[PDB]
């Protein structure tokens, strides 16, 4: 099994730049990998305070005590015991699937494949991170490993849900991470003009009414939904409450 560490071009990911020209790996090499995680840096000063606290604690003056309690309270096991347990589990158990899990995996794969096609037809370029039958085999292997952890001779929905969750995380973090890469913008400014004009601060309107109005006009549904959720992404005058019905203007 291969565990690889890499850095993107231009150091930081530079999300303003397109995903296509941020990764220099071809499609062939990426397909063999099946768990790719993008570790982006962030700044909110709270995670930063927590990390600073953790490092100042993890200096040798303090951790040498605290970590010891982890073997005294039963929270963590030593490395050698973990090695023995993992080799024992590797030798002994080898789980198997069940038809309900197979149906769930099939439906999930169809869903993600259709979502990839949906992104591709809009972006009008090939995806930099592909989704293939290799990925279905990958989810199957993840489920089998999850069942293998507890020595279960059969794999069930409990492990399948966790495997699907991990795959969805590793998919939405890298592949479906802003697929647009940033009618053109002419309708965007036109659409920004009307909502400022027709909807003042403090009042609200139903989503159905606006969708009907701007499908009756030239904007159509494809342009409106993206514009609506990006005006939300701007997050300085548009707020959603009460499910997807109440379009509140903050």
């Amino acid at each position: 099994s291969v565990l690889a560490a890499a850095n993107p071009i231009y150091g930081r990911y530079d999300d303003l730049k397109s995903p296509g020209d941020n990764i220099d790996f071809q499609t062939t090499i990426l397909s063999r990998f099946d768990m790719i995680f993008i570790v982006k840096d962030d700044h909110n000063e709270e995670r930063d305070i927590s990390i600073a606290n953790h490092v100042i604690n993890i200096h040798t003056g303090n951790a040498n005590a605290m970590q010891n309690q982890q073997e005294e309270n039963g929270s963590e096991i030593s490395i050698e015991k973990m090695k023995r347990y993992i080799t024992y589990c590797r030798l002994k158990c080898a789980p198997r699937l069940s038809p309900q899990a197979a149906e769930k995996l099939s439906s999930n794969f169809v869903t993600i494949r259709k979502q990839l096609l949906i992104n591709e037809l809009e972006s009008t370029e090939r995806s930099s991170i592909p989704i293939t039958i290799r990925q279905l085999e990958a989810i199957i292997r993840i489920t089998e490993s999850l069942a293998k952890l507890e020595l279960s001779p059969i794999a069930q929905e409990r492990h399948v849900d966790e495997a699907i969750r991990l795959f969805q995380a590793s998919t939405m973090d890298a592949a479906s991470q802003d697929p647009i890469g940033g009618t053109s913008l002419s309708e965007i400014r036109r659409f920004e003009q009307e909502l400022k004009r027709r909807l003042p601060i403090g009042w609200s309107t139903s989503y159905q009414t606006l969708r009907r109005e701007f499908v009756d006009t030239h904007r159509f549904s494809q342009l409106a939904l993206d514009k609506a959720l990006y005006a939300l992404e701007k997050h300085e005058t548009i707020q959603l409450r009460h499910q997807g019905q109440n379009i509140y203007r903050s």
Partner: protein, 302 residues
């Protein structure tokens, strides 16, 4: 036998290094002590790499000649008081043990083994450790004694590491009547919640202070912290004469007035203390209440 720390279970070098009497007599906390120890070894003639080996595998010839080597080398440096006569117990082919090593193992196993609620939990753990030490007495169990020996080595290492830091930082404040020292912060402070561990640390400090050129016999007050409870565990300690002194100046052992002073101050002021330990010179005091209390102890008749 000799005043040495686990001589028959650790290397001779580690024994000389961790022996409290030699530490006090040679000032091993700074580099000059280590230089003098290497002088000791070079003049005795034992190779350093040989003396850093286990007592079982250490050379038979020098094992036989150790007594003569000590008798001929230790006179120059004033360590000739380390030689004494002790009891050795041998049963079967398991080996040989001594009373000093046995009591050190027992004490260490008592120390380490396995608000009001956590105090009760600590006292229950101490009771369980007492039971484990009691069970370890029988000759049918030796995995409950090897563990005690290794725990004794670890605890002595920790005590030495804390004491050298205390001595170099000079936290010992010298007042007009008694010396004072408080452990505000540091590593592994959670170990010193045990009164016997605190007494061991205080005994080493008392030996180090007594083996000095000062001509003042003053009691020593030591305090610790446990952040979960936010209380100070304070123990009062009596001064001790050097072990190498005649019996003429031993008319009566030094008395301990700390319990009387504590009970008088508690009976005259409403401090939030809890005096319940069987040893009357060990009390628990609050962090906010320590300083005024100390002042009272300064201004009261001892």
């Amino acid at each position: 036998d000799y005043y040495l720390f686990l001589l028959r279970h650790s290397s001779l070098y580690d024994s000389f290094y961790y022996s409290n009497y030699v530490n006090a007599k040679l000032s091993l906390w700074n580099e000059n002590g280590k230089k003098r120890l290497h002088k000791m070894f070079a003049r005795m003639g034992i190779p350093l790499s040989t003396a850093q080996e286990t007592w079982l595998y250490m050379d038979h010839s020098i094992k036989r000649e150790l007594g003569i080597i000590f008798d001929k080398n230790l006179d120059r440096y004033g360590l000739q008081d380390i030689i004494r006569d002790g009891f050795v117990r041998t049963l079967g082919y398991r080996g040989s043990i001594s009373a000093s090593e046995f009591v050190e193992a027992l004490t260490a196993l008592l120390e380490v083994g396995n608000s009001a609620q956590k105090l009760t939990n600590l006292r229950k753990r101490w009771v369980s450790n007492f039971w484990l030490s009691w069970d370890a007495l029988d000759d049918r169990k030796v995995e409950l004694l090897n563990r005690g020996i290794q725990l004794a080595q670890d605890l002595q290492r920790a005590i030495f590491n804390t004491g050298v830091a205390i001595l170099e930082k000079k936290l010992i404040k010298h007042l007009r009547i008694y010396r004072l020292c408080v452990l505000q912060d540091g590593p592994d402070l959670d170990l010193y919640r045990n009164p016997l561990t605190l007494l061991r640390l205080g005994n080493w400090l008392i030996e180090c202070c007594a083996e000095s050129e000062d001509k003042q016999l003053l009691p020593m007050v030591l305090a610790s912290i446990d952040e979960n409870t936010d209380t100070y565990l304070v123990a009062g300690l009596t001064p001790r004469y050097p072990r190498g002194l005649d019996t003429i100046h031993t008319k009566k052992p030094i008395l301990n007035n700390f319990s009387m002073a504590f009970q008088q101050i508690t009976a005259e002021t409403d401090a939030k203390v809890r005096i319940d330990n069987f040893e009357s010179s060990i009390i628990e005091i609050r962090r906010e209440d320590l300083s005024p209390f100390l002042e009272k102890l300064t201004l009261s008749g001892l």
